[PDB]
Amino acid sequence: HATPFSTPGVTEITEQLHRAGFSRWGNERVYNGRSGEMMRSMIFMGPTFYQRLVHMSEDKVK
Amino acid sequence: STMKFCRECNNILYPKEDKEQKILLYACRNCDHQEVADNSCVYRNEVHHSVSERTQILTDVASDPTLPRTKAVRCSKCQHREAVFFQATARGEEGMTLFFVCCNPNCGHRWRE
Amino acid sequence: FIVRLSENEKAEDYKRREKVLTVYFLSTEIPVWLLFFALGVSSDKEAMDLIAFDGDDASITNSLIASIHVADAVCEAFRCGNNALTYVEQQIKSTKFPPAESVDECLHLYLFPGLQSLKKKARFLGYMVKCLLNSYAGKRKCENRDSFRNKRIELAGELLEREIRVHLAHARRKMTRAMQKHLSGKPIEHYLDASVITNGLSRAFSTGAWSHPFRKMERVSGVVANLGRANPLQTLIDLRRTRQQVLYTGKVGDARYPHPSHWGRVCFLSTPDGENCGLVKNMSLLGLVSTQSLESVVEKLFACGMEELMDDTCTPLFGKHKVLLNGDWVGLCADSESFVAELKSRRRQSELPREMEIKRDKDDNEVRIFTDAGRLLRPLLVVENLQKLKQEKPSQYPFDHLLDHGILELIGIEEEEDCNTAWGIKQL
Amino acid sequence: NMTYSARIKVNVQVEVFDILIGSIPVMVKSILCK
Amino acid sequence: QREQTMSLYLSEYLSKKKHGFEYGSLEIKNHLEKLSFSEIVSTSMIIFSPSSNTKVPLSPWVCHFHISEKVLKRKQLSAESVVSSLNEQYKSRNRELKLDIVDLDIQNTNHCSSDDQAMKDDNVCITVTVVEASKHSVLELDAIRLVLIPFLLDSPVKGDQGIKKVNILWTDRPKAPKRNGNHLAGELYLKVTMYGDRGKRNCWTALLETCLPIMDMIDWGRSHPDNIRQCCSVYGIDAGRSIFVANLESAVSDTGKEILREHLLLVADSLSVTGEFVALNAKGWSKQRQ
Amino acid sequence: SSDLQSRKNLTEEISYGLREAEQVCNKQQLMVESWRDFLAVNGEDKEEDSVSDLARFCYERQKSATLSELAVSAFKDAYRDVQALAYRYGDQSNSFLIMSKAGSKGNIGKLVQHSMCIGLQNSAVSLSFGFPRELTCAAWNDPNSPLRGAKGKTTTESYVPYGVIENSFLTGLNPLESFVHSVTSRDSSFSGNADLPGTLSRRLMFFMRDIYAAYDGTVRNSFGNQLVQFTYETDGPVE
Amino acid sequence: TEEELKRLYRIQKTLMQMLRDRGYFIADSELTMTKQQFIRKHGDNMKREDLVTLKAKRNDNSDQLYIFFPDEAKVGVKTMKMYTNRMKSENVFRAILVVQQNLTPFARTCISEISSKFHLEVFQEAEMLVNIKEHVLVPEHQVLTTEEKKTLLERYTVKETQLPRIQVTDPIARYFGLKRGQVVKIIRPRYVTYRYVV
DNA sequence: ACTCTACCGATAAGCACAACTACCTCTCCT
RNA sequence: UCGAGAGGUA
DNA sequence: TTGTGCTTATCGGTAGAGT
Ligand SMILES: [Zn+2]
Ligand SMILES: [Zn+2]
Ligand SMILES: [Zn+2]
């Protein structure tokens, strides 16, 4: 649950993520796709929910 | 501003003065009744300056001015130049004496002139 | 009925321009004390006792004395006989549009229709003047338009009602004109025109211009809006909105900012951005709008312990708190706490309408009861009978069962301030 | 593209010594709705 | 503008005395600040006392003003001083109170024969009695209560009616710099706000007339009105232009942006081509073209 | 924070700093003419009464505008030190600190609101309610709180809201704190003052359009070759 | 009446300073006169008569200006007529009038009607309390002569109309007694500017 | 000494515009 | 298409 | 809803002019 006024603490989220076998801070080691080298800093990745707005490029073309 | 009702018809009394009587009297216009006045006081009001009702909060009337601040003086306990100066009388001294209050939040030092 | 406190400008010289109390009833501009003595009062002391200021202020006493003097000067010997009644009748007849009824009948029905007795409305006027004087002295706060305690909302019961009324009036005018044209020189169906109201409603719905609440002309806009079909959320939030009408948009006041009265009724975090910022408010999830109750709660109130209002103005109210129902002084209560507790207990047992606000304020020493429509309500758990829930026999309780058993109740905005509310179960 | 409304009928009597007045639009899923 | 803010700077000779600037500013504020008689008085009542026809007919309604000595000590005032101030204010205008009033006498008494209340024992009483020229037109109480009492309260015991409020402020970049000596640590100037009740007389000229006893204390070489419109009429178009440039620089600095000096100078020289700072409306442009 | 203990230490430090800032504001509020007898170096027996009335200071601050401004200035001055704790409790590799020091985006105060505490929340316009100094569930139920119309200390008509939020965005906000934040930030979404810059720009352009520099070196107006400036008053460097 | 005496002393000192700035050959003793010396020389009661003096231009003795102090305030047209007759008898083309209060409309019409024959200036006592010229905001003002004005017009090849304007009612213009059609030279703390009296 | 007009300074009382730029859809009629 | 009223973009 | 002019109306108001 992600109820606004009943949100879980950050510690609980970190513990749940740690129990999943990943870093507790939400960042994972990534490797550059162009060269294959390992990046020095971990990159935060997560499945957020996104929305597509009704505004389009071709609708604004004049 | 003193309103009283006569014992006969319970109507408001109007103060009046008679030269021959040389005394304060009250007589209402409803019945021909006159009573002896007491305390010889026809008006008594505590002086107040609250003439702007429900308006002193929205508009800053500046009823209590802020004390001035100077940067010429230098505090003793701390090397801070800002202080609050004002004039006040001592516990038993006669006259006005200049006082100083340090503006440093961590100092809290006050001294005389 | 309007009572205005202002400096006298009629038959007043330069020296005497102090504030006096005036009554604006049917555009007559009558002195307050003449009206007091007309409503079954024969003593200045009794009238002073009716206006129970219970304070020592020089300005209030000066205003009262000035009002007495103005009443005495305007009408000679008004206390004796019925000269005040004749004066007020003459003032009413002096209006450009005087009522057809006589003075003996206008005062009964055009002045405080709720109070049948002629002496009770005098006491109500005294209470009104007392409230005005307390507000002037600063002891009582003035009503604010931003607060929802003093506001009501109408969606379809009243917005369409005035359009129906005005179109029916226009149809009646057309029908009587046609009948007068035809009589001097036909089925009843031909006399009445059916297209009038239909076309009027169609034009009102299409153009979006709705009839002004207080003005015959200058139709208001923004009442009717189009639905959004982009996603179900848009059409869900469009149906649940509240509009605040303001003459101008740039200069409005404090109506654009959230208020503590918005707690739980309308969302304070989501408002449209732009010209109508804060004027349009989205209703909360637990948001209900009260409706008019067919049943009358006057009879049930006397059973709880409320006593009738004293008809005689001579009898004073020592400690009896005032009971007001929809702005009408229905009666009195000896002790407000027990009366309110018993009324709430009766409401929780489904013996009273489920949409009713019971307000008890010790500052004004009165009990305020509302049962009209337009009030915003939300359900709140009641911890007094919360232990009754733990039966363990049933599951999936319907909301009607919970309301009947008193586990949950509908609380108005005015009533919520009186009670103490817990945010979470863990805190409880 | 027509109005979803309902007719109103009231009886009128004229004395000398059910007619149609208008159609009111109907809200969806009201008390009177199919 | 009704407020008509002013700006007064202290003279340099006060620097010789220890803490001279603070004492000078406090004295100027004390002398120039308006103090209403209503604030000083606490209880005002009208007592009925027989006239006894001593030498001149007078109303049998004396005004008793009770003032605590603590307030007088705080405000550095005496009963004789406030009585003299009230008499001076009454004789200064005497345009109000359009009644049969000839002369007004004010008497100071420490202890009064009033048995109505004795809550305060260290409060003096001021007696004000009106005198009528052998007439009974003043015998009524309503006229006295409605006219005389408000007039006495509105009369200032200290300062002048024109000056509304005076506050002492510290600044580091004054609009009017010193001649040559530059302490640069800052100066303690006084900002004076006046009343725009009537535009009959100039506020600056009225302020000059009030500061006659303390002309030496105020450094008139740097003092100037805060307004831009009348600063041209007081000290010339160039002084108004300089003050306008300073205010524009201050506004730009407050905005947080950096603007070159030439732009502001050109704006100032363009808005005062005709020698008068016209408004930004179409009326000002039309007047400038005319 | 490096670990949970560092987070607890930071939370306690922020709480103590906020308490100290509140006390500093209360001390600064006394700089008025009504307390000149108390501020002087004498013998006063009302020293305890000045510190016993803690809730009255908030009510006095909300009613008075000068007191509100003084309290805001004192709170900012005291809260600079509280904001300074981020460098002590922040790692060098922190992205927020890097972006704040580089100046690309954000500042120290935004990071403080992100992690430590939102801080002072005040509104310029006058309102009918006031924040009851605590922003808790118990405060919202107090009949004598400024939020419930007036405190009865005779009634009040307008207020200058003044509230301090101890919680941060990361830790979450209780509904009262969210209400306070929404009241404070509602002024930004308004459409006011959006036409004033445009109108001022148009009028200033109408006034300054005709000005141009002449071949002779003078600054002349287009209408009648009116002399605005004999020479350009720029401090160089190219003519 | 000591306040009136010191007020008159300040007014006289400011008037002498203005005359010296205008070049009327003011003696150094008058400029450096102290308050004690002023009250000793004036006497017990001046009656607003000792201040009335006559001064002549330093360069040319023919030009002369007379300062007039009326005995009473709210002056009328009779005193204006008497002053004009006195000026005609004494053959003086300029005068300075210092009045406690503002002039009557008839007096203003009379003083404006005879402006062509003789030039008269009116100064309020409140204005002369503080010397406007000796101010930090006010820059240096230098009045250009006819030859200087002609050279200025010829150098920039600009008409007198196409110049920044200064109204006659400006305090500096009245302080320097400048008539319409005269340009000024202003030095700012350098770049100089010129203003045309209109 | 003792009286009529007449241009002139300060408060009411109505007009009279104007409250941003570039954009894009949708319904209503016109 | 010529207009009006709404809803949105930067 | 106002900010800013803007233009009469209107209240004395006293200055000359006269007797
Ligand atoms: Zn009686
Ligand atoms: Zn210190
Ligand atoms: Zn007394």
Side-chain angles (χ1 to χ4, degrees), chain A residues 1-11 13-14 16-27 29-36 38-62, chain B residues 1-13 15-16 24-31 33-34 36-38 40-47 49-53 59 62-80 82-90 92 94-112, chain C residues 1-7 9-11 13 15-27 29-53 55-71 73 75 77-79 81 83-88 91-92 94 97-100 102 106 108-115 117-138 140 142-145 147-153 155-157 159-176 178-180 182-185 187 189-190 193-215 219-250 252-272 274 276 278-294 297-298 301-309 311 313 315-336 338-350 352-361 365-391 393-395 397-399 401-413 415-416 418-425 427-428, chain D residues 1-17 19-33, chain E residues 3-38 40-58 60-68 71-72 74-75 77-87 89-90 92-102 104-108 112-113 118 124-130 133 137-138 140-141 143-153 155-171 174-196 199 202-225 227-254 256-257 259-282 284-286 288-289, chain F residues 1-36 38-43 48 50-51 54-55 57-68 70-90 92 94-141 143 145-150 152 154 157-165 167-224 226-234 236-237, chain G residues 1 5-20 22-27 31-35 38-39 43 45-46 48-56 58 67-70 73-77 79-80 82-84 86-87 89-112 116 118-133 135-146 148-153 155-159 161-169 171-178 180-189 191-198:
Chain A
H1 287 59
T3 300
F5 300 105
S6 181
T7 41
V10 186
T11 61
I13 301 180
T14 55
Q16 181 189 19
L17 198 53
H18 176 66
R19 289 194 296 265
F22 291 80
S23 181
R24 64 196 305 103
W25 305 117
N27 44 12
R29 187 72 63 178
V30 300
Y31 311 93
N32 185 22
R34 312 180 188 272
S35 60
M38 179 178 60
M39 295 189 180
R40 296 176 56 255
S41 62
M42 298 183 298
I43 302 301
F44 183 88
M45 297 181 58
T48 81
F49 193 85
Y50 260 77
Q51 304 170 342
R52 181 181 181 181
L53 303 184
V54 297
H55 298 74
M56 307 300 182
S57 60
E58 50 186 346
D59 302 1
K60 308 296 182 179
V61 174
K62 184 181 187 181
Chain B
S1 59
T2 61
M3 52 177 180
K4 54 191 303 178
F5 314 96
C6 90
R7 317 163 190 174
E8 189 171 1
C9 65
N10 291 329
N11 286 142
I12 180 180
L13 289 173
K16 63 179 302 179
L24 187 63
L25 296 176
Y26 281 88
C28 64
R29 300 292 85 182
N30 186 24
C31 68
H33 175 67
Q34 299 183 357
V36 46
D38 291 354
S40 300
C41 183
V42 293
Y43 177 83
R44 183 180 182 271
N45 157 80
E46 308 283 53
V47 181
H49 206 178
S50 60
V51 74
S52 60
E53 301 82 11
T59 301
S63 61
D64 195 0
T66 61
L67 297 179
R69 292 182 171 85
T70 177
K71 296 184 180 181
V73 79
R74 200 171 189 178
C75 177
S76 180
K77 297 183 178 301
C78 70
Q79 309 302 137
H80 192 193
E82 186 177 359
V84 168
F85 71 99
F86 58 94
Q87 273 186 1
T89 178
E94 183 178 5
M96 294 300 181
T97 305
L98 183 57
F99 289 94
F100 290 90
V101 176
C102 186
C103 290
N104 187 32
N106 309 329
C107 181
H109 177 51
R110 48 188 176 183
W111 64 99
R112 302 179 59 178
Chain C
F1 192 84
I2 290 88
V3 178
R4 195 183 309 268
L5 173 58
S6 299
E7 302 182 359
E9 288 287 344
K10 302 173 58 181
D13 46 3
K15 45 165 294 187
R16 292 185 177 182
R17 288 187 176 182
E18 63 198 73
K19 298 181 179 301
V20 299
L21 291 170
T22 57
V23 169
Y24 291 85
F25 174 73
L26 300 182
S27 67
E29 304 178 357
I30 57 179
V32 56
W33 278 76
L34 300 190
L35 183 58
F36 262 99
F37 273 83
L39 299 181
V41 177
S42 179
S43 301
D44 291 324
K45 187 175 184 60
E46 297 182 5
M48 285 296 185
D49 295 0
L50 292 181
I51 312 171
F53 187 80
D56 300 330
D57 199 332
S59 181
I60 302 301
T61 305
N62 293 329
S63 300
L64 293 179
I65 294 181
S67 300
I68 296 180
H69 278 268
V70 168
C75 180
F78 66 97
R79 303 179 178 88
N83 295 119
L85 187 58
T86 60
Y87 179 85
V88 68
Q91 291 292 339
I92 291 179
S94 301
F97 185 73
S102 61
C106 290
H108 279 258
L109 63 103
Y110 271 108
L111 173 59
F112 300 150
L115 299 87
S117 181
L118 192 60
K119 295 184 177 181
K120 295 180 183 180
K121 55 186 59 181
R123 188 180 296 268
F124 189 84
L125 170 59
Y127 166 76
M128 183 182 302
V129 177
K130 165 189 174 299
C131 295
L132 175 61
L133 295 179
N134 292 332
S135 179
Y136 180 82
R140 186 183 183 274
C142 305
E143 283 71 17
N144 297 329
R145 300 181 179 181
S147 177
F148 258 92
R149 181 178 57 91
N150 307 327
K151 292 192 300 180
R152 299 295 183 270
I153 55 176
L155 294 127
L159 300 191
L160 190 62
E161 178 181 3
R162 54 174 179 259
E163 290 279 350
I164 290 299
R165 288 187 57 180
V166 298
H167 287 113
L168 184 60
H170 182 78
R172 286 165 52 92
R173 289 177 173 266
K174 186 175 183 178
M175 178 182 179
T176 187
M179 186 173 299
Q180 289 184 359
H182 180 72
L183 185 57
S184 181
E189 310 178 11
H190 176 266
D193 192 4
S195 301
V196 177
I197 295 189
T198 296
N199 292 20
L201 292 180
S202 180
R203 182 177 59 90
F205 273 93
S206 59
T207 61
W210 220 255
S211 55
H212 193 283
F214 310 101
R215 301 178 182 179
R219 291 180 173 269
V220 297
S221 59
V223 182
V224 186
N226 296 114
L227 268 188
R229 291 295 182 178
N231 43 13
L233 192 54
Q234 180 175 352
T235 185
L236 285 175
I237 65 183
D238 287 0
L239 292 158
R240 313 168 74 261
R241 283 183 299 180
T242 304
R243 185 60 169 269
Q244 173 63 35
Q245 293 289 351
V246 288
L247 301 181
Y248 195 72
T249 60
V252 44
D254 61 330
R256 295 192 182 273
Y257 290 86
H259 200 264
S261 60
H262 299 184
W263 188 282
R265 275 65 188 174
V266 291
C267 179
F268 57 90
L269 229 58
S270 60
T271 52
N276 48 16
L279 302 178
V280 185
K281 296 170 295 299
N282 303 328
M283 198 178 65
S284 301
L285 286 172
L286 297 185
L288 299 180
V289 178
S290 179
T291 56
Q292 184 67 211
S293 60
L294 301 180
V297 301
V298 181
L301 254 52
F302 287 99
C304 299
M306 188 190 67
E307 60 183 7
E308 61 178 5
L309 182 59
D311 190 10
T313 60
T315 61
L317 307 186
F318 309 97
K320 306 171 180 179
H321 293 247
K322 308 180 181 61
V323 181
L324 285 75
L325 174 62
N326 303 121
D328 298 358
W329 196 350
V330 283
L332 300 167
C333 58
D335 40 356
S336 300
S338 69
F339 175 80
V340 169
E342 184 175 358
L343 207 60
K344 290 184 177 181
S345 179
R346 296 288 288 271
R347 182 182 64 178
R348 294 175 183 178
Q349 298 179 181
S350 181
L352 294 177
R354 303 187 303 186
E355 300 81 7
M356 181 184 61
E357 297 181 5
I358 308 173
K359 180 60 180 181
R360 170 183 173 269
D361 44 350
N365 300 270
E366 62 177 358
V367 177
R368 204 173 301 103
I369 304 176
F370 289 117
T371 178
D372 57 331
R375 296 175 289 98
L376 280 171
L377 315 176
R378 72 169 187 175
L380 293 179
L381 294 177
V382 180
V383 312
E384 307 182 22
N385 47 22
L386 190 59
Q387 47 80 23
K388 189 188 304 177
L389 165 74
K390 193 56 182 179
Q391 306 176 3
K393 313 169 186 179
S395 58
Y397 305 92
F399 200 79
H401 181 87
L402 301 177
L403 292 185
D404 293 0
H405 275 194
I407 306 182
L408 289 81
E409 62 181 358
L410 303 181
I411 299 299
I413 177 58
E415 185 182 358
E416 185 182 10
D418 190 12
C419 63
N420 184 13
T421 308
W423 285 2
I425 267 65
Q427 303 179 4
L428 177 62
Chain D
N1 299 268
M2 61 179 301
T3 305
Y4 183 82
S5 59
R7 294 186 176 183
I8 297 181
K9 297 182 179 181
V10 57
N11 51 325
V12 177
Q13 297 182 356
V14 183
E15 300 180 1
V16 178
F17 174 78
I19 65 178
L20 178 60
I21 282 194
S23 61
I24 169 181
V26 180
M27 184 187 300
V28 180
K29 288 195 181 181
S30 300
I31 176 62
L32 62 166
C33 184
Chain E
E3 302 285 359
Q4 197 57 231
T5 309
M6 300 299 183
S7 180
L8 302 181
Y9 298 94
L10 301 178
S11 181
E12 200 185 28
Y13 81 101
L14 294 178
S15 60
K16 303 178 181 179
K17 185 180 180 180
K18 178 181 180 60
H19 297 161
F21 290 107
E22 289 76 12
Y23 278 102
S25 61
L26 290 171
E27 291 179 2
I28 292 179
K29 179 181 180 180
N30 187 30
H31 178 270
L32 202 59
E33 185 177 4
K34 170 182 173 58
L35 181 55
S36 180
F37 177 75
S38 60
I40 299 300
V41 68
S42 61
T43 296
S44 177
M45 59 182 182
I46 299 181
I47 310 300
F48 174 81
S49 62
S51 303
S52 72
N53 311 331
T54 62
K55 289 185 178 181
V56 170
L58 47 86
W61 310 104
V62 298
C63 301
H64 278 253
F65 296 89
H66 284 242
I67 299 178
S68 59
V71 177
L72 297 178
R74 295 172 185 177
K75 300 298 180 59
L77 288 179
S78 61
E80 293 76 19
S81 61
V82 303
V83 165
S84 60
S85 180
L86 293 183
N87 291 126
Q89 292 294 149
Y90 171 80
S92 179
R93 305 167 297 182
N94 201 22
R95 301 310 301 178
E96 289 74 13
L97 300 86
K98 298 300 298 179
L99 300 176
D100 190 7
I101 170 64
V102 179
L104 186 65
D105 51 318
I106 305 176
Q107 300 294 339
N108 172 37
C112 61
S113 180
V124 302
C125 182
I126 296 181
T127 300
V128 179
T129 308
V130 294
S137 60
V138 76
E140 69 274 5
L141 178 70
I144 297 299
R145 181 195 64 179
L146 291 176
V147 183
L148 177 63
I149 299 300
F151 179 79
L152 298 181
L153 299 182
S155 56
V157 296
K158 299 175 61 179
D160 285 58
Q161 283 280 1
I163 308 300
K164 181 176 182 179
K165 61 184 63 179
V166 176
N167 43 17
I168 305 180
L169 302 179
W170 182 276
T171 184
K175 267 64 181 178
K178 307 179 184 64
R179 330 289 173 85
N180 49 13
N182 182 24
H183 309 275
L184 208 52
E187 56 188 7
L188 199 57
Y189 77 106
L190 290 81
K191 182 174 300 301
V192 180
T193 301
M194 303 185 62
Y195 271 113
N202 196 334
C203 298
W204 179 258
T205 59
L207 180 59
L208 290 178
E209 299 291 339
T210 304
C211 299
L212 288 180
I214 52 180
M215 289 293 292
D216 301 359
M217 301 182 62
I218 289 92
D219 186 10
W220 302 108
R222 297 193 301 161
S223 300
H224 61 79
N227 197 332
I228 319 297
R229 191 66 173 92
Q230 71 138 351
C231 187
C232 302
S233 62
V234 173
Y235 285 113
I237 178 63
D238 304 326
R241 173 190 175 274
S242 60
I243 300 300
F244 168 79
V245 169
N247 287 121
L248 192 53
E249 294 178 9
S250 180
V252 170
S253 300
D254 295 0
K257 221 64 177 182
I259 301 181
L260 297 174
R261 186 69 173 273
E262 41 270 21
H263 301 168
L264 313 183
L265 294 179
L266 181 63
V267 171
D269 297 359
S270 178
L271 267 62
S272 59
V273 178
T274 64
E276 177 183 0
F277 275 92
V278 300
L280 289 180
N281 306 329
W285 195 85
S286 181
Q288 182 176 356
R289 291 300 163 267
Chain F
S1 296
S2 300
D3 59 330
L4 182 61
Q5 189 69 209
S6 300
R7 188 62 180 182
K8 297 180 178 180
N9 298 334
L10 180 59
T11 300
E12 298 179 7
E13 186 164 348
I14 292 303
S15 62
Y16 276 98
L18 291 181
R19 187 181 307 176
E20 188 269 352
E22 186 271 347
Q23 288 190 352
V24 167
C25 296
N26 294 13
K27 176 181 179 299
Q28 189 73 202
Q29 288 188 28
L30 295 181
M31 305 302 178
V32 294
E33 297 183 356
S34 180
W35 295 93
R36 292 182 296 182
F38 176 78
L39 265 59
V41 186
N42 287 316
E48 186 67 23
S50 60
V51 302
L54 187 62
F57 279 156
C58 180
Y59 178 81
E60 294 180 13
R61 182 201 304 109
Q62 293 179 358
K63 295 299 297 298
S64 300
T66 59
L67 277 66
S68 300
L70 295 179
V72 165
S73 300
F75 199 92
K76 293 182 178 181
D77 192 10
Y79 198 77
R80 294 174 184 177
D81 301 330
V82 178
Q83 294 181 1
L85 309 179
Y87 301 92
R88 296 187 179 185
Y89 286 83
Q92 184 183 3
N94 194 318
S95 58
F96 288 151
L97 281 175
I98 289 170
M99 290 179 293
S100 301
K101 295 178 181 180
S104 301
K105 195 65 61 179
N107 52 27
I108 178 62
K110 289 183 181 302
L111 178 55
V112 174
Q113 298 184 184
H114 266 273
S115 300
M116 277 159 290
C117 58
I118 301 182
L120 179 54
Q121 292 295 305
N122 60 329
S123 61
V125 303
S126 300
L127 300 178
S128 60
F129 57 94
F131 308 143
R133 208 197 70 89
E134 291 186 357
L135 310 185
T136 57
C137 178
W140 192 82
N141 296 325
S145 60
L147 192 60
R148 297 271 67 91
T154 180
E157 58 278 1
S158 300
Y159 285 86
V160 182
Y162 185 97
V164 181
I165 298 181
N167 299 18
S168 61
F169 287 144
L170 179 65
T171 60
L173 303 181
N174 53 266
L176 189 46
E177 290 183 357
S178 67
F179 176 82
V180 169
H181 180 61
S182 61
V183 168
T184 303
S185 60
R186 187 60 61 88
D187 55 354
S188 61
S189 61
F190 296 158
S191 179
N193 298 275
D195 50 357
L196 181 57
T199 59
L200 180 140
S201 306
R202 185 203 176 189
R203 294 193 294 264
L204 190 58
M205 189 66 61
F206 260 95
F207 267 84
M208 302 284 296
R209 192 178 307 166
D210 305 356
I211 302 181
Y212 73 101
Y215 279 97
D216 299 330
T218 66
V219 181
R220 293 169 176 257
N221 191 308
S222 180
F223 280 143
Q226 180 68 207
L227 262 296
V228 182
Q229 295 183 351
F230 292 87
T231 49
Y232 204 6
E233 296 180 348
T234 175
Chain G
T1 179
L5 261 57
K6 64 181 300 180
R7 176 200 189 99
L8 265 60
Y9 163 74
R10 294 293 301 271
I11 298 310
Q12 185 269 354
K13 182 175 60 181
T14 309
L15 286 170
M16 292 304 177
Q17 183 70 16
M18 180 180 63
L19 290 184
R20 186 261 297 269
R22 204 179 299 183
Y24 269 86
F25 192 71
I26 302 301
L31 296 176
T32 58
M33 179 180 299
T34 60
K35 180 180 180 179
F38 177 82
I39 64 180
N45 197 331
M46 310 185 62
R48 301 182 181 271
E49 302 301 319
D50 181 68
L51 304 91
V52 176
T53 50
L54 197 153
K55 296 297 181 179
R58 179 189 302 264
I67 313 178
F68 295 149
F69 286 84
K74 56 185 60 180
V75 303
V77 80
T79 168
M80 294 298 301
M82 293 191 304
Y83 279 154
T84 53
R86 183 178 182 178
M87 293 186 308
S89 302
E90 297 179 359
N91 191 265
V92 287
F93 306 96
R94 262 193 171 186
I96 300 180
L97 188 61
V98 181
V99 192
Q100 313 173 17
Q101 302 178 1
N102 190 20
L103 308 186
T104 65
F106 291 92
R108 308 205 69 85
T109 56
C110 180
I111 196 180
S112 60
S116 61
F118 303 97
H119 184 254
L120 301 185
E121 301 176 354
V122 183
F123 289 88
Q124 300 292 152
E125 294 184 353
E127 302 178 0
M128 305 304 300
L129 289 177
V130 180
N131 184 22
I132 305 301
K133 186 260 182 179
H135 200 279
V136 288
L137 298 177
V138 181
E140 299 289 344
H141 287 267
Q142 183 177 0
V143 185
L144 297 181
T145 61
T146 60
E148 293 294 335
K149 178 178 179 297
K150 182 178 181 180
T151 53
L152 173 64
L153 294 184
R155 180 163 60 94
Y156 292 99
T157 325
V158 58
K159 304 177 181 179
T161 304
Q162 308 173 356
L163 288 178
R165 310 182 188 274
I166 168 179
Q167 52 190 6
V168 184
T169 60
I172 299 300
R174 304 189 300 102
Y175 183 88
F176 286 88
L178 306 181
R180 305 178 186 269
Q182 298 179 350
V183 299
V184 308
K185 189 177 185 301
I186 302 179
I187 290 86
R188 302 181 182 271
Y191 46 91
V192 301
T193 178
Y194 306 92
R195 309 298 290 265
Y196 176 81
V197 172
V198 63

